[PDB]
A and B are shown apart, each in its own frame.
Chain A
Amino acid sequence: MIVPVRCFSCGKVVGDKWESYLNLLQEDELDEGTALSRLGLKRYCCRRMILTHVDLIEKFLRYNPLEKR
């Protein structure tokens, strides 16, 4: 589903960094370890939450019973 707002272990706000993360991997073309360090994630608790997120909400939203398919 959507990215968690806070890290589970420390509690830093992590939810505002998912769309900034995908810009760095797509547009700026960095690897995953350098894009996470540029967003400020440095404890490996919060580091593995943007790193390891699936984002299934883009797969759920294809099924919409409120508009013509």
Chain B
Amino acid sequence: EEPDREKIKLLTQATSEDGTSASFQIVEEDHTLGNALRYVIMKNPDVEFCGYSIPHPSENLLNIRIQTYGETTAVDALQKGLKDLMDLCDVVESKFTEKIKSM
């Protein structure tokens, strides 16, 4: 049982006590998913602040930061955004399939 845990990492030096504010650090990412995910987290009506930041371009590290209002922690806003981007790639893949089957 070896799941990978060096991918996503909660930076505890910038995380609030309640969990309503937290910063993360994904390895091996950049503007690709850093901007596509930031778009979908900001569509949650409880996310007060969201943004990604690449600390240096020469290494593959991606700090994102979610701050909420209340009744949803900043981890629960990350995994709600990751679910709605999984569901957003299903809509693109299934519309683009139906237009190849229609030609």
Direct contact of A and B (CB under 8 A): no
Task: Give A residues with C-beta under 8 Å from B.
Answer: none
Task: Give B residues with C-beta under 8 Å from A.
Answer: none
